[PDB]
Every structure is written in structure tokens, then in C-alpha cells.
Amino acid sequence: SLSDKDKAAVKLLWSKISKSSDAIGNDALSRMIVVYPQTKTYFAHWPDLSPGSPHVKAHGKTVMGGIALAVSKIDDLRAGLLDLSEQHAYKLRVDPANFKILSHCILVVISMMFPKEFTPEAHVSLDKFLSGVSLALSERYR
Amino acid sequence: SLSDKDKAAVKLLWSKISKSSDAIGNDALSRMIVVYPQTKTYFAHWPDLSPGSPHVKAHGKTVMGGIALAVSKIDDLRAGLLDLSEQHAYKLRVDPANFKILSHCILVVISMMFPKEFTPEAHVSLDKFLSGVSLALSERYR
Amino acid sequence: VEWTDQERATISSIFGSLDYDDIGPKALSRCLIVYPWTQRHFGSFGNLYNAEAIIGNQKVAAHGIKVLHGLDRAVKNMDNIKEIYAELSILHSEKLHVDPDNFKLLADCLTIVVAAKMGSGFNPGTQATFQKFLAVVVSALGKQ
Amino acid sequence: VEWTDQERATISSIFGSLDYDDIGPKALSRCLIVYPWTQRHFGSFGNLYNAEAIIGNQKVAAHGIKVLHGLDRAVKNMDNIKEIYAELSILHSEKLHVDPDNFKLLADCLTIVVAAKMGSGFNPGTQATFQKFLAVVVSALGKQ
Ligand code: HEM
Ligand code: HEM
Ligand code: HEM
Ligand code: HEM
């Protein structure tokens, strides 16, 4: 569970990075599909994610829009993200082993793009948050 | 021909950018081979230049080392770059239509990486310089 | 020329992201500084003796903004560019006597100014589509 | 594991570029903050009650530097990693009682610290090779 300090930390970091959220999302998805090639099947329909290809802001905004939703619903992630759990489990059938993978790639991108703001305190709170998001997303799978 | 102001301008810009010269070189070569695909044949032997692949500092340093040479020999580019003209014309047989292409891609990279320092005055002097380098490199072709 | 949906989106995305009142004056002024013979048809009253004078010239600034607005018609109708620019091509050749080579020089300066604005986002594929689009426009304008 | 020449070069390049006295303390301190059960085997005398205390802890800083120096042996001999780490694996299991899971957590923190240092240079392929290398090391160390 997220403490009030954690929730404050997540909101503060988000206030600093949300303006680059399309870029964060594109960068995280692109590295996920390369580093973790079992994931390419989920995004082969978005060939813009191939390195070197022009960036589609709406593709990055998709995933980071989910994170923005989670920041707004940070007091009750399970209820907040229940529809997105259904989408991933039923509609898309994303293997749930991948939520922790995308989480890691988001942390890597944030560290690369915002090294001053991504302190170890920012990282622990954001990591707890993303564990929370991944568990919420995993709710409908079984 | 380069004026004393031009030579000063080129030296000053070079003093600001030379520390990133491996990165400049890699970025310029990689975009050249994508934007101008007739050039891929020259660099297919360096698969590191594919977008997303790990960067080989020595590959970027190759081309930008030629530019560094040219900055040191800026009072007499034809004599300074004559050996590199022979390498490109005879050893490698690079089509000389490509010197102006790589020149443009170097300017694009510099503009992307050093937008504050790449003023229009910096650009005119650097462009004249790179026209000079391309002509020097073209010397041995016919 | 043939255009894919991906390419049409990229061009729309790039141009949507630009502040034409900033980028236009920057591109034309840069062209008049790097290729100073492109001053030929400006400075009929004032002088253009250095970069500060060219960047300060109001008519040059205004025209760089007109160039960017002029490119909008092509952004929105990428498969009719030749036809769209037929009247502006006649204006620039028959009335203004602009050399057709000057359009290629301006296109390069615009690419260098857009690259500075987009930073690392101006990756190889982005540059490829952007330059393809300008090349089509340059070809339509440079008809005599 | 099999390694290509390209991969061996990348690992050499990444590690050559790092200041171990800066990156080592950063990676271990970060691990003790993000995964605070990894304090278990530190703080035998002083306390580690917050991030400032952990980053200020001299023994933690010194050990992060030892971790980076320890990775050098693998950088230089990528095809014998299991054998190279056999004595340090015994030390960390039999004498120190470090959980083998803790090596994976430290590897993630090291990747996040190296990504911050390399910036955009830490592209997808670079991350792939770097994480493959750490994974091999983690597998050798985490033997009981
Ligand atoms: C932090 C974890 C994640 C968040 C916050 C997230 C968020 C979202 C959002 C908001 C959508 C849009 C749903 C809609 O159309 O309404 C989406 C779609 C999608 N997600 Fe995720 N997602 C996450 C993880 C994953 C993972 C791990 C994968 C695959 C490895 C995945 C693959 C997809 C795919 C394929 C779509 C459909 C995209 C499209 O064609 O529209 N997601 N996700
Ligand atoms: C600004 C223009 C250019 C400069 C300053 C430049 C500089 C150099 C330098 C210094 C070398 C190393 C020569 C050596 O081994 O001693 C080199 C090699 C090479 N250049 Fe260029 N070059 C230029 C343009 C081009 C262009 C336009 C092409 C092709 C489109 C090209 C393709 C090559 C190739 C293929 C090599 C061999 C690389 C290798 O395998 O070692 N160069 N160049
Ligand atoms: C994509 C390239 C370009 C576009 C879209 C463009 C567009 C325009 C437009 C919309 C006008 C106003 C037309 C009118 O009177 O109603 C104009 C005027 C003008 N353009 Fe361009 N132009 C371009 C390139 C150039 C270049 C390269 C030059 C010269 C180097 C140039 C020189 C002029 C001049 C001198 C006028 C002023 C005419 C006057 O005072 O009556 N243009 N341009
Ligand atoms: C790649 C991973 C790691 C490497 C290369 C590494 C390397 C080393 C080395 C070289 C030493 C000194 C050995 C000696 O006494 O001569 C050491 C000591 C130690 N390591 Fe690690 N280590 C790693 C991971 C970890 C982790 C994850 C933990 C705990 C979370 C840890 C806890 C310790 C402790 C407590 C000691 C001190 C033992 C003492 O005071 O005698 N190590 N490590």
C-alpha cells in the first residue's frame, strides 16, 4: 500500500513529467518490444514503434494515459483500473507476466529523461505505485 | 573561400561540439543511410548504425575525426584532405554525389543537438566549410 | 508521388506541433544568411548587410510566416500538391523572378530549423518523410 | 550463454565509460532505498532510517564500489562468468546469507543508474545487451 508520502511523491514526479508523457510512452513501448521480444506480438500492429520510425504521439499517450488515470485514482487503484484490467485480460489477452516488464521499462525511460527528478525516493514511491497498477491490471485474469 | 571570420566561427563551434563528436558522427551516418538509401551499401558492414542498435563510438569518431582534421587544416583543405580524397575515391569508391548529402545530415544533427550554438552565422560558416571539405574530398575523383 | 496513411499522419503531426510565427521567420532569415543571394528579391528599401539586419527585417519575417501558412494547404491535401501550388508557382516565376533553385535552399533551411525544434524526435524516419514532403512542394513551386 | 563480438564490445564500451566511484554507491544505495529489506546485511552498527542516511553510509558506498569492480572480471571474460564468480557466490550465500533474489534487485537498480548516466545513448539494443550481461552475472552469483 501507498503511504501519504508515496502518493505525494508520485503526484510531484507526475507534475514534472506529464508534459513529456507521449514521448515516455513511446520510448517505453519501443524498448520493451526489443528487450523482451515476447512482447512484439502485442505491438506489431503499430509499426511506428520500430526504432527510427516516426513517433505517433497517440500511441505513447495510450499507455501514459493509463498511468495518468492511475495517478488520479491513486487512492483506489483496483476500482480505478478495473475497466483497463478487463481490456487487457479479455479484449486484448495480454499475458500478465508483462505488466512488471512494462513497469521496469517505464522506470528506465524516466531515469533516462529526468535523471535529476528520478531520485531514489522518487523511484521507491513510483515503483510501489507501478506494482499497485500491475496488481490492479491483473485483477480480472483469474 | 573561408574568411577569417568564417574560420573563427568554425573553430568556435567546433570547440563547443567536439566532445560530442562520436555521437554526432553516429547520428549523421545513421540518418544518411535511412534518408538516402543509396548510401546503405557503404555502411551495411557496420550494422551498429541501424536505429536502435548499440552505438560504436569508434564509428562516429571515424567520420568526425575527418572533420577534426579539416578544422586543423582549415587554411588549406585541399592539401589537408588529399589522403582522405584518395581513400574515398580509390580504396572505398564512394560515389562523390554523397559528400553533399553527408554534409547536410551533419548540419541537421548539429542543429538537433546544439540548437543554441547553431545560429545562422554558425551555419553559414560551417556550410561553407563543409562545401570546402566536400570539394577537397572530390579532388581525386577526376 | 504516393503517400501512406503513416506518412500523412507524420506530416500533420510535425506541422501541428510548430509555432508558425516563430518557425517561419527563422527559416527564411536563415536562408537569406546561409545563401545570401536569396536576398535578391528583399531589401528593396532597407539593407540586409548582416544577420542581425536580416533577422530584424520585418518584410522577411512576415514572408517566412506566409511560407509556413502556404505549406498548410499541402499538409491537408498531400495528393494534389502540384495543382494547389500552380498559381503560387506562376507568381514566383513570372512576377517575382525567383530562381527555382531557391526553393531547395529554403527547404533545407526549414529542415534545419524544424530539426532544432523537434530535437531527438527528428529521427531518421521523421526526416525522411519531412524531406519527401518538402521535395514534392519544391517540385510544384519550381515549375516555370 | 553465447556472445558475439558486437556484444562483447558494447559491454566493454558501457563499463569503460562509467566512473565506478560515482555509479557504484548510487546503485547500491538505490537498491537499499527501493528494496529496503536489502538493508538486512548492512547497518550492523549505524542506522539506515531514510534515504539520506543510506546515501551517507560509508560501508554501503564502499560496497557499491566493490560491486562495480567485481563486475570487471566478467567484462573482460564474458565466456567464463559462472567460473569467475564461484568463490564470490559461496561467500555471499554461505557466509553473508544474501538472498539470491537480492542480486536481481541490485541488477535492476544498476540498470536504472546506468540509464540515467547514458541518457538517450541507452537505446533498446544497448539495454538488451546490458541486461543480458547482468543476467548472466546474477545467475552465477545466485547459485547456493
Ligand atoms: C503499466 C501497465 C499498463 C498500462 C497503464 C496500460 C494502459 C493501457 C491503456 C490505457 C490502453 C488503452 C485501452 C483502450 O483502448 O481504451 C492500453 C491498450 C493496450 N495495451 Fe496496455 N497498459 C499497460 C500494460 C500493457 C502491457 C504489459 C502490454 C503488452 C505487453 C499491453 C498492451 C496493450 C495493447 C496491445 C493495447 C491495445 C492498443 C491499441 O491497439 O489500441 N499493455 N493499455
Ligand atoms: C564530410 C565528408 C566525409 C568525411 C570528413 C569523411 C571522413 C572519413 C574518414 C576520416 C574515414 C577513415 C579513413 C581511414 O580508414 O583512414 C572515412 C572512411 C569511410 N568513409 Fe568517409 N568521410 C566523408 C564522407 C563519406 C561519404 C559521403 C561516404 C559514403 C556515403 C563515406 C563512406 C566511408 C566509408 C565506407 C569508410 C570506410 C569505413 C570503414 O570501414 O573503416 N564517407 N571517412
Ligand atoms: C515553400 C516555399 C514558398 C512558399 C509556400 C511561398 C509562399 C509565398 C506567398 C504565399 C507569398 C505571398 C503571395 C502574394 O502576393 O499573395 C509569397 C511572396 C513572396 N515570396 Fe514566397 N514562398 C516560398 C518561397 C520563396 C522563396 C524561396 C523566395 C525567395 C528566395 C520567395 C520570395 C517571395 C517574395 C519576394 C515575395 C513577395 C512578393 C511581393 O512583395 O509582392 N518565396 N511567397
Ligand atoms: C553483482 C553483484 C555483486 C557483486 C559483484 C558483489 C561483490 C562483492 C564483493 C567483491 C565483496 C567483498 C568480498 C570480500 O569480503 O572480500 C562483497 C561483500 C558484501 N556484499 Fe556483495 N556483491 C554483489 C551483490 C550483493 C548484494 C545484492 C548484497 C546484499 C543486498 C551484497 C552484500 C554484501 C555484503 C554484506 C558484503 C560484506 C561482507 C563483509 O562485511 O564481510 N552483495 N560483495
Author numbering:
A (entry chain A), B (entry chain A): 1 to 142
C (entry chain B), D (entry chain B): 1 to 144
Article excerpt on this structure:
The superfamily of globins includes proteins that are ubiquitous in a variety of different living organisms, from bacteria to higher eukaryotes, where they perform key functions essentially related to their ability to bind gaseous ligands. The globin fold is made of six to eight helices that constitute the matrix where the heme group, which is deputed to the ligand binding, is anchored. In this scenario, we have undertaken the biochemical and biophysical characterization of the Hb isolated from the sub-Antarctic notothenioid fish Eleginops maclovinus (Hb1Em) that lives in the Beagle Channel surrounding the Tierra del Fuego (Argentina) by experiencing temperature ranges from 4 °C to 10 °C32. Particularly, Hb1Em exhibits the Root effect (drastic drop of oxygen cooperativity at low pH) that is physiologically necessary to secrete O2 against high O2 pressures into the swimbladder or the retina, following local acidification of the blood in a counter-current capillary system.
